Design a protein around this ligand. Structure first.
Ligand SMILES: CCCCCCCCCCCCCCCCCC(=O)OC[C@H](COP(=O)([O-])OCC[N+](C)(C)C)OC(=O)CCCCCCCCCCCCCCCCC
Ligand SMILES: CCCCCCCCCCCCCCCCCC(=O)OC[C@H](COP(=O)([O-])OCC[N+](C)(C)C)OC(=O)CCCCCCCCCCCCCCCCC
Ligand code: SF4
Lengths: 155, 70, 98, 57, 115, 83, 175, 318
């Protein structure tokens, strides 16, 4: 029956998405520098099909790298709202995940989730480059477990 | 470890390889083993037309020598 | 006189109408003007290739070289009215009245 | 103490001007960098196979 | 025929690519996507205003040089003439006029990208 | 004297491209007149028979024109073979 | 049947011209001119004018490029016009379609259309000429004769292009 | 079987462009101490497939402030011209023996402006409207130099028949006669394809992308296909034009192998240059050709038109 064909097809599609996610950089603080180290020779993000450089129009994943302040929030909102589907947003760093060192500030939102949906919470201050990379791999396995056309066929 | 690039362009080479003989072979395939008779000037076109008429099969690349004539 | 001659002559007639009957735009009008010379270029090439006028084979490009020069200044004039006036819309183009 | 970084003004003999004209026209420092990057191409790539291999701690 | 067949094949192939591109994927079609973009913001009230520019002069001298390039294009056929001396002098005239136009463009600001 | 040489040196340093272009151009006009082979190029161009050499009606007293296409007398281009 | 192509090449030339002259948005007039020139290059080409056809291709698809170059510079506005903006443009367009259609219908029925001059509706393939070219293209050799017989033409042109760059300098100089 | 030959021309060029997107990410990375993509299949061989599938099934966003007609036509023009501009290339037996093949292909090379302008304006964004005019000026201002270089090089070939170009070289590489010219030509090629040293349109500080900003998914990928097909096509053009090869008529495959090797070498030089050099500035970008390249090109053309006359070595017309 139809599950065989639809599962093989959507498995193909989600594999293609999984191995070609394109980050939308978006580094706000030292988490940006650690991500840049994560794209350095040593860990070489670009090996996994991730491309690091991506205009927000052509991109799949946003890494909220650093503290997100009140003045920033509308800009990040307009950036994500324009991001084409599918759009998984990963938050790196204790500051972006929620609060941070500057949790009890006056012009820093207490978490990217209060601004934008977060798909993978990456902890660390900063999350050491390979921890970020592991979060990326976790998102890849999340894309692997994707059943879009299955749910369509079984709606 | 530059040889990791070697597969990458190798298929690429093959990718550019195919348009080479494919056009080359098909010409040889179509024109009775001969390569295509390029007609860059009207004299060449007239020669090709007379060859087509003489062939009697509406195929220019078919050629007959003195055995065709007395 | 076959249909190709009709078609390019008729194309020239409507280019005459389009450029000369202004609607509201100077840029589009000179665009119609340069399309005019395209119609004339094709037309000229037709007889010249037809009649084996071997020398006249060089007349079209010659005819071409000057014609673009006209447009070369036309659009050049277009900017000079544009920076002061603002647009190429020829209905404000009224200061010279008396 | 201190060192002046860029005061090395060039000479103006025929040899020096010919060398500078050749470098400007026959692109040389361009080729210098173009060949250095080639040397880095043939080198051993620095890359750790995550997650099979982890960074030193 | 032949050549026209290749042009037809290419244009139809391209159109199939764009059709699959624009039709196959699915979009939720929500309003706020339509908001335009500029490095995080939107392009305020611009991206169609008249463009106060200066390299217009470079753009027009392009065309003026392109006419002369068209004029000198017949050279490979022209070199096959009996009176090679006149062809040599007159082609050299054409390139000298190219250079003179460029030089007048040069000294009189001109090709110097206006500020 | 000194001023001209110094100006040439400065041009060769300040805008080297300009002097190279001006030089090679200045050659481009003055060599063809000086060169002794341009006449040979004219001979090359006149040698090629793009059209048929339509014969002349024989009536006697044209020894210059060969009677046969294999005849010895007539125009020859052995210089073309040696060239 | 691809017999009538040498006809239709001109026909698509006509109605691509009308929309080009239908006074639409300047870029849409440009598109009309572009399709007209692209289809007219075929008209010259299938008549044997290979070099002239490719020549007009090159120079003209640069020439409309530059007239674009100011259309987005010195001709755009807050609300650029659209090929459907004005109501009259549709009437101009349809008046473009029906005139040559009626005339070609007549030329297909009577073959003696009386519009302006004298014309016959019996295609265009007839007017070609039998013959040969040896080992030289007539068009290329003719345009090559510019440097041997075009004594005055190249001189007056080059002088005009020099004067043209001078005037382009002077009018746009801006004091 | 003509249409079969056509398809055997398009489709392999499509795989070539597809795997160029892998060889660039591998060559660049190895040039900058990165292993490159080697996770999707063996040595990253399958990676171009995955990104292509993603971009096909990525949502193509319609620019709300746009007229869709040009938003769709511009990819059509850019892609179709790029592929049909491969038509008259002298493979050992070129597909279409157009008597003016070089002029044919040079004329079509100017048409990329006719995708750039509609992409930049129709998408209706500041980055798009800037980059449209900037890139248009780039490519048009380098097209002239391409033209005089082509003419000066051809003045020794004999005609515009691009199949006889091989017959021109035969003995010696043509660069040995026009290395000053080719050095300009190649660079101008680098300028016309908008590559990192001369790109100026991406400029990911003040133009971001320039023309392919609002384009997404499929129409967006079509302009990449055009761009990385022009790379291969112009590198192949330069390869035959200057880096000649042998061709025995009884063995057509030999010239095919030599030509594809030359094309790969030149494309690797493209990637080589982009992986090292900084990016030009628009001021310097047009200063490079107006102030420097064009006078040298004019003088070299004068030299190369006077030279056959004085040497009595005019090339055969037919
Ligand atoms: C060559 C490519 C071959 C494979 C083509 C795959 C196309 C995938 C399209 C994108 C994912 C959507 C899909 O598969 O079905 C659409 C279906 C559409 O029906 P749906 O109801 O499942 O959509 C999700 C729910 N709404 C409608 C609210 C958005 O969506 C999904 O499968 C997503 C779950
Ligand atoms: C019709 C619609 C689709 C149109 C596109 C073409 C058809 C679909 C794609 C088919 C190929 C890919 C299938 C999915 C592969 C996948 O997910 O993993 C592959 C995998 C890759 O494995 P991997 O390395 O990703 O595994 C995971 C590794 N870790 C855990 C470290 C993350 O490889 C295989 O399955 C083996 C066979 C690969 C292909 C063999 C041939 C390669 C050489 C020729 C390449 C060029 C010609 C093709
Ligand atoms: S979580 Fe730590 S490293 Fe990241 S932005 Fe906050 S303070 Fe900096």
């Amino acid at each position: 029956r139809g599950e065989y064909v639809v599962a093989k097809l959507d498995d193909l599609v989600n594999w293609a998405r999984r191995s070609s996610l394109w980050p939308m950089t978006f580094g706000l603080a030292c988490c940006a520098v650690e991500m840049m180290h994560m794209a350095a020779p040593r860990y070489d993000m670009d090996r996994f099909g991730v491309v690091f450089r991506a205009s927000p129009r052509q991109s799949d994943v946003m890494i909220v790298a650093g503290t997100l302040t009140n003045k920033m929030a509308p800009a990040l909102r307009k950036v994500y709202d324009q991001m084409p589907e599918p759009r998984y947003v990963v938050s790196m760093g204790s500051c972006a995940n929620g609060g941070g060192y500057y949790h009890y500030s006056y012009s820093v939102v207490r978490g990217c989730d209060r601004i934008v949906p977060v798909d993978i919470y990456v902890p660390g201050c900063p999350p050491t480059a390979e921890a970020l990379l592991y979060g990326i791999l976790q998102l890849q396995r999340k894309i692997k477990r994707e059943k879009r056309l299955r749910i369509w066929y079984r709606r | 470890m530059w040889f990791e690039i070697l597969p990458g362009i190798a298929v690429m080479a093959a990718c550019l390889f195919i348009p080479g003989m494919a056009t080359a072979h098909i010409h040889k395939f179509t024109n009775g083993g001969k390569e295509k008779r390029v007609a860059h000037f009207s004299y060449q076109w007239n020669l090709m037309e007379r060859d087509r008429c003489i062939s009697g099969v509406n195929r220019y690349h078919v050629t007959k020598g003195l055995e065709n004539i007395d | 006189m076959p249909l190709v001659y009709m078609n390019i002559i008729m194309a020239f007639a409507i280019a005459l109408a389009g450029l000369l009957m202004y609607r509201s735009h100077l840029m589009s009008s000179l665009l119609c003007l340069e399309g005019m010379m395209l119609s004339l270029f094709i037309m000229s090439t037709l007889i010249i290739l037809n009649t084996h006028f071997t020398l006249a084979n060089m007349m079209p490009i010659i005819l071409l070289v000057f014609a673009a020069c006209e447009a070369a200044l036309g659009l050049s004039l277009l900017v000079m009215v544009s920076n002061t006036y603002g647009t190429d819309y020829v209905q404000n183009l009224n200061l010279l009245q008396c | 103490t201190y060192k002046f970084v860029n005061m090395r003004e060039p000479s103006m003999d025929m040899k020096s001007v010919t060398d500078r004209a050749a470098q400007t026209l026959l692109w040389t420092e361009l080729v210098r960098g173009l060949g250095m990057t080639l040397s880095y191409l043939f080198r051993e790539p620095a890359t750790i196979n995550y997650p099979f291999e982890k960074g030193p701690l | 025929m032949n050549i026209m067949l290749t042009l037809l094949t290419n244009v139809t192939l391209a159109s199939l690519l764009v059709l699959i591109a624009f039709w196959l994927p699915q979009l939720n079609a929500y309003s706020e996507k339509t908001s335009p973009y500029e490095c995080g913001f939107d392009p305020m009230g611009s991206a169609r205003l008249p463009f106060s520019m200066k390299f217009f002069l470079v753009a027009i001298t392009f065309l003026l040089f392109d006419l002369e390039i068209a004029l000198l294009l017949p050279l490979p056929w022209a070199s096959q003439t009996n009176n090679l001396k006149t062809m040599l002098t007159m082609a050299l005239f054409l390139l000298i006029l190219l250079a003179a136009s460029l030089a007048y463009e040069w000294t009189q600001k001109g090709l110097e990208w206006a500020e | 004297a000194g001023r001209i040489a110094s100006f040439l040196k400065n041009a060769w340093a300040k805008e080297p491209v300009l002097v190279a272009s001006f030089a090679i151009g200045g050659l481009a006009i003055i060599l063809p007149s000086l060169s002794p082979y341009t006449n040979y190029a004219i001979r090359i161009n006149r040698a090629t028979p793009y059209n048929y050499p339509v014969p002349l009606r024989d009536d006697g007293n044209m020894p210059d024109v060969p009677s046969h296409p294999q005849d010895p007398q007539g125009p020859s281009l052995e210089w073309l073979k040696n060239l | 049947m691809t017999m009538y192509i040498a006809f239709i090449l001109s026909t698509i030339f006509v109605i691509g011209f009308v929309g080009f002259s239908s006074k639409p948005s300047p870029i849409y007039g440009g598109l009309g001119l572009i399709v007209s020139g692209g289809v007219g290059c075929g008209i010259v080409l299938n008549f044997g004018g290979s070099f002239l056809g490719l020549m007009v291709f090159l120079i003209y698809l640069g020439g409309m490029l530059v007239v674009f170059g100011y259309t987005t510079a010195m001709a755009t506005e807050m609300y650029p016009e659209v090929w459907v903006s004005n109501k009259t443009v549709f009437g101009a367009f349809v008046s473009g379609l029906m005139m040559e259609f009626c005339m070609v219908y007549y030329a297909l029925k009577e073959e003696e259309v009386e519009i302006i001059f004298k014309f016959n509706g019996l295609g265009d393939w007839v007017i070609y000429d039998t013959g040969d070219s040896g080992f030289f293209s007539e068009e290329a050799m003719g345009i090559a004769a510019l440097y041997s017989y075009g004594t005055w033409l190249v001189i007056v042109t080059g002088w005009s292009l020099l004067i043209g760059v001078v005037v382009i300098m002077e009018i746009t100089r801006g004091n | 079987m003509f249409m079969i030959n056509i398809l055997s021309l398009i489709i392999p060029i499509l795989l070539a462009v597809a795997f160029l997107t892998l060889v660039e990410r591998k060559v660049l990375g190895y040039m900058q101490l990165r292993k490159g993509p080697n996770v999707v299949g063996p040595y990253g061989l399958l990676q171009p497939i995955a990104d292509a599938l993603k971009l096909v099934t990525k949502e193509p966003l319609r620019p709300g402030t746009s007229s869709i007609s040009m938003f769709i036509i511009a990819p059509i023009l850019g892609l179709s011209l790029a592929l049909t501009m491969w038509v008259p290339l002298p493979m050992p037996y070129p597909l279409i023996n157009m008597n003016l093949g070089v002029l044919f292909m040079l004329a079509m090379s100017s048409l990329a402006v006719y995708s750039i302008l509609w992409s930049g304006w129709a998408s209706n964004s500041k980055y798009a409207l800037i980059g449209a005019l900037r890139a248009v000026a780039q490519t048009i201002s380098y097209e002239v130099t391409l033209a005089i270089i082509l003419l000066s090089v051809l003045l020794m070939n004999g005609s515009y028949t691009l199949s006889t170009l091989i017959t021109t070289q035969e003995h010696i590489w043509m660069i040995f006669t026009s290395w000053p010219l080719a050095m300009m030509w190649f660079i101008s090629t680098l300028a016309e394809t908008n590559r990192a040293p001369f790109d100026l349109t991406e400029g990911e500080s003040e133009l971001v992308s320039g023309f392919n900003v609002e384009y997404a998914a499929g129409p967006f990928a079509m302009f990449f296909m055009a761009e990385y097909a022009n790379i291969i096509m112009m590198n192949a053009f330069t390869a035959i034009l200057f880096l000649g090869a042998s061709h025995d008529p009884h063995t057509p495959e030999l010239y095919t192998i030599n030509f594809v090797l030359k094309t790969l070498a030149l494309t690797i030089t493209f990637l080589w240059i982009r992986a090292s050099y900084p990016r030009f500035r628009y001021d310097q970008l047009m200063h490079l050709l107006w102030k420097s390249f064009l006078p040298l090109t004019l003088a070299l053309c004068m030299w190369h038109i006077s030279l056959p006359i004085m040497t009595a070595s005019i090339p055969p017309q037919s």
